[PDB]
Write a protein that binds this ligand. Structure first.
Ligand SMILES: Cc1cc2nc3c(=O)[nH]c(=O)nc-3n(C[C@H](O)[C@H](O)[C@H](O)COP(=O)(O)OP(=O)(O)OC[C@H]3O[C@@H](n4cnc5c(N)ncnc54)[C@H](O)[C@@H]3O)c2cc1C
Ligand SMILES: Cc1cc2nc3c(=O)[nH]c(=O)nc-3n(C[C@H](O)[C@H](O)[C@H](O)COP(=O)(O)OP(=O)(O)OC[C@H]3O[C@@H](n4cnc5c(N)ncnc54)[C@H](O)[C@@H]3O)c2cc1C
Ligand SMILES: Nc1ncnc2c1ncn2[C@@H]1O[C@H](COP(=O)(O)OP(=O)(O)O)[C@@H](O)[C@H]1O
Ligand SMILES: Nc1ncnc2c1ncn2[C@@H]1O[C@H](COP(=O)(O)OP(=O)(O)O)[C@@H](O)[C@H]1O
Lengths: 449, 451
């Protein structure tokens, strides 16, 4: 059977490998419009920060055309799919070097076209001093342009802009970080967490320009100035846009069911509204467990799992999607910040009524020769007491705790469950009750009044 | 109503505090045979290893007679409960300073009498150069007296013995570690984990004397010679016995339902077979989730949980025990070793049929400036694919991953759930799939091939 995979980074690479693994009757073709596949975008900030082995971006690839071709896939780089017609099971594809366009049939189509960076329709985006940050070629451009810059402006303080700002400030660039929200990582963490980060930014010489969106760029002399709606004008050698992503799904607009942003809605086996077209990764919606609904959560975690499920379910509905909790994290200036599920910002934006407790405790006993404060939040349903989300931050790497809370959320466990569930004690690791147990107990006490 | 707590370390302290917080009409008396309460025995190896603040063991106490008295408890230290008579609801109590005995009534009795050290009738075990290691007074004695020794022998390589060998090996004593098993931590971790620990012991000068039990001790001059069955004679200045514990439960032998070893069987609200006598901690059996049955898992985690449940359930059946998974861990020479649930050694002892996979992966990508291998095992039920246990070890602190597996066991999650459940990705922490996901995927691959 003929299987065509459109796009080959995280989701497409996994879909190809799992398909070939489980269906030796599959003749697979991958179309990718870039001149590369299988590049780890999630390593870009460490690469630009000069914090990967030998500063060598070859180590950020987890596959290659030769590897996939030896599995037996027909890998066609610099090829752009320009049409999909679900009713006839055909696509049109353009060779980008020769401009030659061909229509071809498929038995199954896998839409792993991901997302593109959001580029706001404002003056100056065409400047050679404005940089995107999504893919290998973007990364290479930034890494090569670094020696010619001493001042960088980063627009957008989501996960990517937060990491870049840290990465450039640790190399003694002058850094400006600009966002329309009044806090960094506004949608991602409570104020008690982002206040800590802001303090660290200012201690490392980062100029935080918060509360007004960028309205324009203007290239003048060997610099660009970034201009906010409220009148500020910020000069740098270069500027980097980090204001999010949108599903790359124009090919299927009006043809399969989608969220308002274009994310392809799928059943539990990764089929779109058309049975022979699968979607996975940043092209697709996820089943979000905390609100039992479809959501857009463009993370590599979802790309690899969705890609895997496409391969598993290619011919048969064999393995249901477990859904996801938006588990994510970062480490900035040595401090870990992790979260899973819902937070109070996202609850307010969606008119959900939730409860939350915020507590701080040393992760292990004070009699130890060292310990560190862990700041913790737990978000739960006031009526069912089911856990809906949580977040932790410490100088100690508490990241694996977000995975504990993710499993709680997956099983719809309550604050009462978390309060008492067995967790190991040894003073090198924790107090007799683990800090997650203590968090649950604090939520219980709040709920009981 | 009159509440009597017998024994006051982990379980008894939690029981007293929770009881008083939830039951203003409880009139609590606490009897403790020792001259101290509320000491953290789980801190002794760090104290003895000079790895706590100011090497001050007062920092290991989580309560005090003054604190419990201010809450309204009548704290009676150096008092031993010598009899419990359910038929009259009375106990007998000896004052250990004066030898006087008095009888009193109870409405509720809370048996938090814990465990006592196993001491077999091995000849010479009585010697003044043989030390126990259970409580504050044992620890204080070792802290005072070990510096006089050049060579320390540790008998028993379970959790305590292993910790003590590490602690003393880092202060440049000669250390012998003796055990009847062929591997350190035999009961607790697979060989793949314990081979690593053994070489670390050896590289820090610890002499491992494995495979033969101690048969006799002999005191000669100012030394003690420990003699194994196989003919080895191990000379040292002192010996420390770390060969386990048993329930301290003679007061109720023949009076309430127990396991063969004396552990008091309770219902989900911590009642013994006698409605007005509760049990919590090392005196009690746990509800062990992996086998869905009663077991003896003497850990602080169970003591604090069971003590809390006694206080919550003192007058009304309010909160059910969720049971436990035997989650435990050590950090030895900077390496984390953690476990939850069943292991293959334990299954093989109880005739349980399980499957297990063991894999090793770097915890985070190889392009990072550094990463560390994490060695991992997962035990699961071949018929239901349900997770029954797991273990991890790494130079990176992967301890909280054992708690992820604990929560999976709690919920009877399968290897297939573990393979795909959402866990975060950032290259500072892990690969796109977390090492635990990778573990579940390995278990899936094994289970699928074997049919
Ligand atoms: C800088 C950065 C840091 C990130 N950090 C993290 C992190 O730490 N953890 C985490 O979990 N996630 C992180 N993310 C998100 C994560 O990288 C994405 O969710 C993931 O890359 C999505 O993978 P994908 O395969 O769905 O899509 P994409 O990576 O978007 O790849 C889609 C591919 O499809 C190709 N394509 C598109 N249209 C066509 C067409 N018409 N014809 C042919 N080919 C086409 C594109 O060229 C591209 O190669 C980060 C993202 C970025 C940009
Ligand atoms: C050295 C060591 C290290 C350990 N490490 C860990 C670890 O890292 N993590 C973990 O989870 N667990 C660990 N444990 C186990 C943990 O300490 C025990 O599970 C816990 O102490 C048991 O608490 P308890 O209150 O049940 O009993 P116990 O601490 O044994 O206390 C019972 C009390 O009852 C008193 N008593 C007994 N009989 C009478 C009587 N008749 N009258 C009056 N008083 C009486 C005793 O004097 C004692 O004070 C360790 C144990 C030791 C000894
Ligand atoms: N025009 C703009 N000027 C400044 N900030 C903007 C602008 N447009 C969007 N943003 C900000 O960019 C961020 C969007 O990034 P986000 O998608 O949430 O994270 P990430 O890009 O790392 O996935 C938000 O904090 C938002 O306020
Ligand atoms: N006579 C003996 N000689 C040497 N080792 C012994 C002897 N008796 C018991 N042991 C060992 O003592 C160890 C006790 O450890 P265990 O009870 O399982 O953990 P813990 O440190 O909590 O006490 C066991 O490995 C057992 O082999």
């Amino acid at each position: 059977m003929k299987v065509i995979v459109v796009g080959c980074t995280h989701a497409g690479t996994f879909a190809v490998k799992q398909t070939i693994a489980d269906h030796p009757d599959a003749d697979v073709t991958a179309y990718e419009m870039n001149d590369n596949i299988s590049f780890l975008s999630c390593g870009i900030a460490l690469y630009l920060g000069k914090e990967i082995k030998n500063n060598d971006p070859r180590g950020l690839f987890y596959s290659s055309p030769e590897e996939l071709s030896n599995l037996g896939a027909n890998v066609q780089m610099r090829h752009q799919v320009t049409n999909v017609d679900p009713e006839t099971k055909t696509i049109k594809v353009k060779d980008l070097i020769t401009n030659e366009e061909k229509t071809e049939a498929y038995d199954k189509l896998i839409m792993t076209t991901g997302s593109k960076p959001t580029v706001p329709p404002i003056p100056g985006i065409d400047s050679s001093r404005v940089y995107l940050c999504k893919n290998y070629n973007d990364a290479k451009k930034l890494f090569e342009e670094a020696p010619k810059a001493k001042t960088i402006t980063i627009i957008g303080s989501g996960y990517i802009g937060a990491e870049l700002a840290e990465a450039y400030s640790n190399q003694n660039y002058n850094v400006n970080l600009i966002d329309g929200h009044e806090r960094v990582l506004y949608k991602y963490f409570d104020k008690e967490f982002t206040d800590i980060l802001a303090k660290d930014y200012e201690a490392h010489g980062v100029n935080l320009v918060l509360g007004s969106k960028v309205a324009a760029f203007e290239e003048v002399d060997d610099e660009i100035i970034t201009k906010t709606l409220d009148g500020k004008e910020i000069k740098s050698d270069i500027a980097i846009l980090c204001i999010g992503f949108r599903p790359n799904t124009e090919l299927l607009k009006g043809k399969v069911a989608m969220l308002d942003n274009g994310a392809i809605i799928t059943d539990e086996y990764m089929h779109s509204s058309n049975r022979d077209i699968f979607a996975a990764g940043d092209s697709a919606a996820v089943h979000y467990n905390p609100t039992n609904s479809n959501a857009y959560i463009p993370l590599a975690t979802n790309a690899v799992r969705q890609g895997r499920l496409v391969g598993l379910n290619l011919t048969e509905d064999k393995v249901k999607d477990m859904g996801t909790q938006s588990s994510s994290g970062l480490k900035l200036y040595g401090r870990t910040y992790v979260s899973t599920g819902i937070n109070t910002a996202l609850a307010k934006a969606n008119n959900l009524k939730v409860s939350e407790v915020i507590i701080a405790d040393n992760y292990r006993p004070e009699f130890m020769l060292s310990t560190d404060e862990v700041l913790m939040s737990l978000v739960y349903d006031p009526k069912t007491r089911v856990i809906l989300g949580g977040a932790l931050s410490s100088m100690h790497d508490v990241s694996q705790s977000a995975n504990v809370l993710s499993v709680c959320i997956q099983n719809k466990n309550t604050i009462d469950d978390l309060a008492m569930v067995d967790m190991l004690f040894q003073p090198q690791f924790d107090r007799p009750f683990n800090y997650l147990n203590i968090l649950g107990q604090a939520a219980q006490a709040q709920a009981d009044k």
